Write a protein that binds this ligand. Sequence first.
Ligand SMILES: [Cl-]
Ligand SMILES: [Zn+2]
Ligand SMILES: [Zn+2]
Lengths: 304, 305
Amino acid sequence: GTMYYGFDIGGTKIEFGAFDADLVRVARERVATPTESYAAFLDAIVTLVNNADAEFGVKGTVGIGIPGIADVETGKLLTSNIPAAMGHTLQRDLEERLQRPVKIENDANCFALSEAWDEDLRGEPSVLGLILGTGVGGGLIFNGKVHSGRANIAGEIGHTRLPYDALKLLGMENAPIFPCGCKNSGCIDNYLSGRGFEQLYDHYFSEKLSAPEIIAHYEQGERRAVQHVERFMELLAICLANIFTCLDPHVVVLGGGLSNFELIYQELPKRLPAHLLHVAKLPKIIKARHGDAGGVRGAAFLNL
Amino acid sequence: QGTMYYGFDIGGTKIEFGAFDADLVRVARERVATPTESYAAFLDAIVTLVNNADAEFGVKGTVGIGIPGIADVETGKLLTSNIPAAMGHTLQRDLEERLQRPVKIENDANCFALSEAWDEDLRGEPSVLGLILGTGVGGGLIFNGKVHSGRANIAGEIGHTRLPYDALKLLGMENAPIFPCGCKNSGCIDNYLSGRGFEQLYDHYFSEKLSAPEIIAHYEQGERRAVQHVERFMELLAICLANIFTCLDPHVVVLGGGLSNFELIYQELPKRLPAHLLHVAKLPKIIKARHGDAGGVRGAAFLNL
Ligand SMILES: [Cl-]
Ligand SMILES: [Zn+2]
Ligand SMILES: [Zn+2]
């Protein structure tokens, strides 16, 4: 009698999934995201919900994942990649049209919640999801529920500054201080992401290589790539140790392009203990399992 | 039988006990000596209080215990240097056996935060961060009225995170004071943002060893050095907290410990935090603890709500 719907809103496509009481996906639909019209945007979502409700014979719950946030006070979307919905009160408008509550969360929160509801992680008291891509995105799950935060920006771990011990590793007053898109500076977003991995390589070795090129060189034993990787893994361990001393997560799930670098899962357990408290224990650290289905899954799971 | 929630606060010399009914009315209060050596005597003191209360109220009460330390999450052994009688013992398992019911044991800073989070004004807040600013920085993370203990029972050890880059910049980067830490790391914010940290920063910059109350009294008199120290301290506090808040985004932040009595904190933080937060961020509500150093019992009891 219960169905959970999830929408993942991208700049060009809206993805839809319906999950039964056992969290098995029983419907999948994809429609175009309207480029300009808000009215068309609402219709696309309302239509999907009404059709699914007719199909499954229930009134499904509605969760939506977005590349941005809803302003916690006004309900207006801050989603620059979705011009049709930018500035609009999406939740209120959908609640009125669908006559039921609607939840809207940032895509990184949906990613973490999706991974936290994997059979292997169900019942974990806390899960931290980190996406290491062009930036660092984070999602904090406690007892299977997203912690959104006072202003819907819990998990913005990427916009915390390099800690003293990370600065020390990188040469203190000679460390590279990368400018940040948030307009602060030295945010870890610019060090631990895939882009950060690249920028650190370029800063020290004066050659602009992509992460896969660096990794391929690493595997060939090229000395510059080997030195870069050594520095990167220690830097990652120091920064995550700082984060883990505050959050002490039970499981850490990595997504984004850099989570494909398998060496991470070998090196973190070896390097974290030196930077953690003496009594600390290591979280389980794994690569994301749900991939492209993450956005829809986590959005749906907002209403569990 | 009715619900009854018991809480114990274990200190080095006293064990404090409280019972709270379904409405969270306190219906018992007892204080007994903490045994100095005997583990047997330690267990008896607790078991006695539980059994007497159960008989008196006609209930089987839930049992929560706040300790100055943690239980090892794997072995159950207590890591509590201030309590030599219980140090190294499997307190939870031993009490569960004697009392035939589950027992929850949590660090005292978690109990402090949970106690505050269950005040009428904060009930219903989706998240509460408690920070105790005393001889060190203690922290407690509450989500939806429940303690997040962490993978190894040390969630909230915010005091053992290192100064962020922006804090170091304020303090002079390569010339900043790097204080050694009891955890054996260095530059942990435990040694900057606590009452002791406030004192050590004053001494580093002004070459005079004053207590926090002396500095504050001089601040209130408009003394130049104290005014400069307070300006530096408030900005340092805002920077470090803004970093913490960018990760945690707590709805409410509750300050305890001696330094939470410095009223200026509550005025200055809202003014200084925005520059270091994300542009879209909003300020948490930041308040002084309501229940003082007498919420260990409350928080311990509330572990079982
Ligand atoms: Cl799925
Ligand atoms: Zn930033
Ligand atoms: Zn420390």
